Amino acid sequence: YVAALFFLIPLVALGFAAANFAAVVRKPEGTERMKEISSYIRSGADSFLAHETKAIFKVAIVIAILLMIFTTWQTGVAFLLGAVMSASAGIVGMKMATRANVRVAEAARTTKKIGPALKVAYQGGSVMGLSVGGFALLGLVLVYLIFGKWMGQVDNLNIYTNWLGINFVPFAMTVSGYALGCSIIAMFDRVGGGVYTKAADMAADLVGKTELNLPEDDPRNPATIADNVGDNVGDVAGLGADLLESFVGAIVSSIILASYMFPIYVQKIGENLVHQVPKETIQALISYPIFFALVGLGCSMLGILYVIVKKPSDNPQRELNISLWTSALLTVVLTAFLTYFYLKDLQGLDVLGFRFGAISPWFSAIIGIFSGILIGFWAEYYTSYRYKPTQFLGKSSIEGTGMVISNGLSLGMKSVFPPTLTLVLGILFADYFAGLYGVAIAALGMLSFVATSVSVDSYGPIADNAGGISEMCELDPEVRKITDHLDAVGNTTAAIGKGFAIGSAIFAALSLFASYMFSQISPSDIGKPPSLVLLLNMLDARVIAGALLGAAITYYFSGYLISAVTKAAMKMVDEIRRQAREIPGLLEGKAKPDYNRCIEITSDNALKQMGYPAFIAILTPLVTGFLLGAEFVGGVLIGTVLSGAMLAILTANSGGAWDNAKKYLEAGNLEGYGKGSEPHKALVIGDTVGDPLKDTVGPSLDILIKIMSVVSVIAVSIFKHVHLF
Amino acid sequence: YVAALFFLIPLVALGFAAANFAAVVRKPEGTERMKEISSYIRSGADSFLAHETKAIFKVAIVIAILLMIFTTWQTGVAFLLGAVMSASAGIVGMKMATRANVRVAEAARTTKKIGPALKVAYQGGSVMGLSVGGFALLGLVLVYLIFGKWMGQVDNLNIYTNWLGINFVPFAMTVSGYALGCSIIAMFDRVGGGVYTKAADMAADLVGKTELNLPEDDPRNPATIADNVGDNVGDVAGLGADLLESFVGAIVSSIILASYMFPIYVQVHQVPKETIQALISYPIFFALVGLGCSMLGILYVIVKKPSDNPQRELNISLWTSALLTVVLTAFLTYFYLKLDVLGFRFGAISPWFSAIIGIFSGILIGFWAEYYTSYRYKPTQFLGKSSIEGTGMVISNGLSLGMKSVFPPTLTLVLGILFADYFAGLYGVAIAALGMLSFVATSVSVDSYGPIADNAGGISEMCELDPEVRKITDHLDAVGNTTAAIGKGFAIGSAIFAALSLFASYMFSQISPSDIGKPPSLVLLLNMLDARVIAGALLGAAITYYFSGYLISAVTKAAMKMVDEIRRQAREIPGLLEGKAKPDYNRCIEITSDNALKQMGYPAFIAILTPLVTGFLLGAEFVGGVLIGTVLSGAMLAILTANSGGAWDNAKKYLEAGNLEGYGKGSEPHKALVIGDTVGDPLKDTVGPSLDILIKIMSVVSVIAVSIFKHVHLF
Ligand SMILES: NC1=[SH]c2cc(CNC(=O)c3cc4ccccc4[nH]3)ccc2N1
Ligand SMILES: NC1=[SH]c2cc(CNC(=O)c3cc4ccccc4[nH]3)ccc2N1
Ligand SMILES: [K+]
Ligand SMILES: [K+]
Ligand SMILES: [Mg+2]
Ligand SMILES: [Mg+2]
Ligand SMILES: [Mg+2]
Ligand SMILES: [Mg+2]
Ligand SMILES: [Mg+2]
Ligand SMILES: [Mg+2]
Ligand SMILES: [Mg+2]
Ligand SMILES: [Mg+2]
Ligand SMILES: [Mg+2]
Ligand SMILES: [Mg+2]
Ligand code: NA
Ligand code: NA
Fold it and tell me: Are strands B160-161 and A273-275 parallel, antiparallel or unpaired?
């Protein structure tokens, strides 16, 4: 029927991405030096991503075997499917960007205008965004059809108990495994690529600009190629992995709640269970988020096509915002129709959530979108150098490096507010509209047009690489100005994407707190009213202690990521100093440096440090539970949500502001002081201090939130009574 | 009987502090240049503290009148009493330090050893700590005797409702007003002094060391005198205010919970009135025993043979005070309390155990502080080493060190909460919150010891003395920074415990006389799955972060103003850098004073209003969520900022001791460490301390005012 037409949308999106790749590759590349630089960066990125993928997939096979042992095999199969999906999205994005960077560079060089370069960069971004959306929805639909339909886990959806004494719902456990695989692979990719790129960027920027007195991404700098390999590895593949994980997480949270609703909402009447809701309603609610995501992917495809066929403009932010708005409006309308018709007459919504009938979920979704948009706007206010905060930061740059650091930290901590209030209002409204199911539907709708968001976000790194390639090949300063404008727009878009991701994570984390309080129910007491089930008393000393511990664990995770970055940062700083002083004629320009040193340093550090964060995110719930019950784990989840949201928003805004103020000063817009002045060095120090907090901690925080919440939701059935205290 | 002997302890502490002040003043000060510099610094500190005190006391009178209007007059009277108590403790500490700085400096200069300077600095610190403890306990005992005994508010312990629809217990409301006044005055003092001193320090350090290439606190630097006046204003008066506020807040939380326990635990009252009265009076006797043990430890450490390692002497003081407190409080709990229905599961000794936790917790925190802040350990030394790689490296490694150190103390607090709960419910949780500050006198002493050493070093460097004097001052100042970090940890831990206890008291206060029968098991219930509660938690975390950011910005404004002023002076006054001209310290003094006085008001009003607005907007669950998020985020940020600022400052000092191989005071690593120290100053001396004050003030205001918007909410 129409379900098949909907389920074929992800394949159309993947085909569109492949077509965009074929079109960009058919574009003309640059000169011979441009080809050589692109080859260097592409080879580095390919090698590091190959090593990362091998390691991550070994770990993924191990985790899949464990999941198969301790739960149903369907869980392990879904885990592997999600791992493959996220890894493939990341690899596709990286393999597309490694080729589109030089294309954008050559376009901006020949045409001397922003239109063509913007168009090619948006083509690459669309490749990655369509790949992400299509992979996520394809994995989800394959799971829903094989383990939900072919095997019929969506038909029984009952509370079984496995051999290890674990209470589980079949389709619930399968989607949990799928989301866990997605999020764990995304965690590995993000941590690795972030460590790599941020160490390289810190070392190169700091040493070169502040000490050696070189231009940004100068060929004499033995770390520039490492920096660009990181831009392609950590800022692309990791970005796609994280965003696909967020999309799949919102959708799987909605689906898990819908599935768990059926066997719990029952009435015990003389030892006879009477289901308060018909199975058809739960099945409609389960299939609803998938159709929602498919309609959203279609609307994103429409907007991306309109923006890639439209006449190019000189203001790239205008084009990106036009794409986002068109996708969002198409999604709103088509999803209104989908919610009205699909949920027409179900007869069981009143019992759970929806108070305004079939349209109740749609409203929630709307909230999400709007919420996201709001955050987006706020991002552009705090990150863009065309507004008050970033400009005041750039001005304060005249007073000293310490002034820059303090003002950046204050700007981040202040910007923490408006988006948090947006999320508060969104939570309240989605609740009022359709309970926790609508909370999850809003989490999803905030990313309903995830394809366009991922596209507009990945657009940036391509422009950054184009600028790096133009600087390495000594191009016309007009090319550098085009790349700098595109890169500022890309920083704004990356801040917007981080905000979107963190908001979706918070919404899905509330929905998952609900599902986690649900999973604790055993078949023995499968009759108590959900009003008593969904209860996590905060006055229980265990819960508040767990909240404290979760906040501390989030902060320690961020600190460990920062330290893992700074280790390689210092190593490469020292290596660059050594090369500058021990290689004859390197600074004069008559000698070639050794980029391989920094490449290998960053690769080794990233490969060594990428493992611990994922394992922490996987184990923390299990250990905390087996030590102090399930209320402590609930408190830990609460504290994790709070601290992670706060730190992620703060770091995203602060890093965006710092980088855009550095770029604004580099454009000479700072009266009197140029690109080589002491204020520029202070802004460079600020940008290096913002780099690791913007490209590592922030993104990884939401992945940690979702991974930990999913692990707890899956494993609470055990430590609920197998605790030590 | 023996109760009068107990009620006389705070007066003895105040007398001991006055005697220590008279003894330090009887010591010989330095030369004419030292006398002139000390007089200038004392005049500046006195002037700024006078203005700050006048403004804060006008605001305090206004707030007391408002409290009298909307609640009982006893609340306003106790508010004024606590305001006066905290302001007096701070002013006494500051007036003692402004005179003890030059005395410590001259002692360390003449003796050429660390012993005499350490002894005099600890004398000043003991003056301030005894002042704080004595004033806090005297105000609290006067309230307990006048409104608790003379008027007998501890006799009825009923749930009344005032004309504005507020449910309250008489003595509960009175102690709430006292603690609220204490915390609001501490908030004003802390915010003002922190802005002042941190702006001055940022300006001076950055401009002088990074640009003009001058030594720390050089007379040519027109901000060194302003920086030291700030050290005396914000790091002394504010410190005493904050610590007295935490002490009184723990005790008042204990008292409020004890009072509210009676009329709620009914089936017929589940607990006899005598038991509730004994539990109400118990925290006061506990605090008195703790003050006595702190006095004993301070006396032993000021009479004990001086050592060359001052941290050893300070740790010996802390250990002796803590052990004396543990033993004497064990005896007090055994005899005075010579329960099962509420909390205590091990009989009369149940509360004492909890207190122990607190103490030990504090002690534990102490070690962790000394592990992360002292340059004699791995983290601070690694930071100093990373200083060779660049300023950005210093900043990133400092942030990482703070965020990691955030953990061990958090786990300590988690275990303490869990164990105190297991032992004696929320009453024992609050008693542990208090016991962590049981020896608050010794803690305040060891903490105020630091700023005195900082001022002595600044004065010795201003007069160009013997480098041995500067080395003595640097060692003492590093020890003082470590002790200040330990004190901040003490405050934040006590704040977390008391904030949980106040969450309990706030869930209790919502009970109205109409439904004064529901089982307490159902009353103490704040479901976290309520969308409103989680939204409020998110909003509270965001509000804490914005509070911190606004404080940082208030600091950076005056910091930039003074940086520009110093550059202008350097370029337009002939011979200033050459040394043939005299700078204008009054300019920086006035800049920082004006900025601090202007920015000093808003944070306290935010902390006071946020609960009221959030409540009248979204019921009581939203306010509960806001309190939870605020507590969590504030604890995290306070621990992080304290540890990070300590690490940065001690790494700078570790590089100053030459322990960094090859690089001296003028090398790029020293400039990077100075940039790190300037970035840490505002996060260490302004945000961190204000966070726990905000937590306590907001939770107390909520506990008092929830009775209105609990059902008079807009949604
Ligand atoms: N129009 C309608 S009535 C209706 C009823 C149900 C199932 N049980 C109930 O609501 C139910 C209400 C209630 C109140 C007190 C005690 C026990 C109770 N049990 C589900 C859908 C539906 N739709
Ligand atoms: N419209 C209506 S109210 C109503 C009430 C009753 C009798 N008690 C119940 O059903 C009932 C038991 C139970 C246990 C847990 C959660 C919810 C529950 N509900 C039966 C039918 C009916 N139909
Ligand atoms: K970027
Ligand atoms: K200090
Ligand atoms: Mg850079
Ligand atoms: Mg880059
Ligand atoms: Mg670049
Ligand atoms: Mg950038
Ligand atoms: Mg950068
Ligand atoms: Mg300083
Ligand atoms: Mg000082
Ligand atoms: Mg000083
Ligand atoms: Mg100091
Ligand atoms: Mg300082
Ligand atoms: Na995410
Ligand atoms: Na405090």
Answer: unpaired
Closest ligand 1 atom to residue A274 Cα is: 7
DSSP string, A653-713: HHHHHHHHHHHHHHTT-SSS--TTSHHHHHHHHHHHHHHHIIIIIHHHHHHHHHHHHHHHH
Residues B437/B249, Cβ–Cβ less than 8 Å:
no
- Residue A387 backbone zone (phi > 0: left; psi -120 to 50: alpha; other: beta): beta
First to last CA, chain A: 54
Residue by residue, DSSP assigns A613-669 as: HHHHHHHHHHHHHHHHTTHHHHHHHHHHHHHHHHHHHHHHHHHHHHHHHHHHHHTT-
**φ, ψ dihedrals at B564, nearest 5°:** -65, -40
Strands B160-161, A167-168: parallel, antiparallel or unpaired by DSSP? Answer: unpaired
Q: Which domain holds residue B240?
A: 1-715
Q: Is B498 exposed, middle or buried (0-12, 13-18, 19+ CB in 10 A)?
A: buried
A392/B contact by beta carbon, under 8 A: no
Contacts of A651 in chain B (CB under 8 A): none
Find out whether B615 and B706 touch, Cβ atoms under 8 Å.
yes
3-class SS string, A48-92: HHHHHHHHHHHHHHHHHHHHHHHCCHHHHHHHHHHHHHHHHHHHH
Enumerate residues 6+ apart whose C-beta is below 8 A from B317: B122, B297, B298, B300, B301, B442, B445, B446
Q: Which H or E run contains B217? A: none
Q: What is the dihedral of CA A430, A433, A434, A436, to 10 degrees?
A: 30
The binding site of A for Mg(2+) consists of: 201, 205, 228, 231, 464
Element spanning A275, H or E: strand A273-275
Residues of A numbered 680-709 whose beta carbons fall under 8 angstroms of chain B's beta carbons: which are they?
A: 685, 688-689, 692-693
Give Cβ neighbours of residue B633 (< 8 Å, ≥ 6 apart). Answer: A551, A642, A643, A646, B540, B541, B544, B545
Nearest residue of A to residue B640, measured between CA atoms: A555
DSSP string, B15-26: HHHHHHHHHHHT
d(CA A2, CA A133): 20
C-alpha dihedral, B58 to B60 to B64 to B66, nearest 10°: 70
Helix, coil or strand: residue B411: helix
Q: How many CB atoms lie within 10 A of CB B613?
A: 12
- The single-letter DSSP state of residue B683 is I
Helix ranges restricted to H, B436-510: 440-462, 467-509
Domain count of chain B?
1
Selection from B234, B180, B212 nearest residue B455 by Cα: B234
Residue with tokens 């060089």: A109
What is the phi-psi region of residue B168: left when phi exceeds 0, alpha when psi lies from -120 to 50, beta otherwise? Answer: beta
Nearest-CA residue for ligand 2 atom 22 is A267
Instruction: Tell me the DSSP string of B235-279.
Output: IIIHHHHHHHHHHHHHHHHHHHHHHHHHHHSB--BSS-HHHHHHH
Integer Cα distance of B189 and B183 in angstroms: 10
- Closest C-alpha to ligand 1, atom 12: A351
Decide: A619 and A67 in contact? Cβ < 8 Å. Answer: no
Mutating to test ligand 1, I would choose from A262, A276, A277, A531 the residue with most ligand atoms within 8 A of its C-beta, which is A276
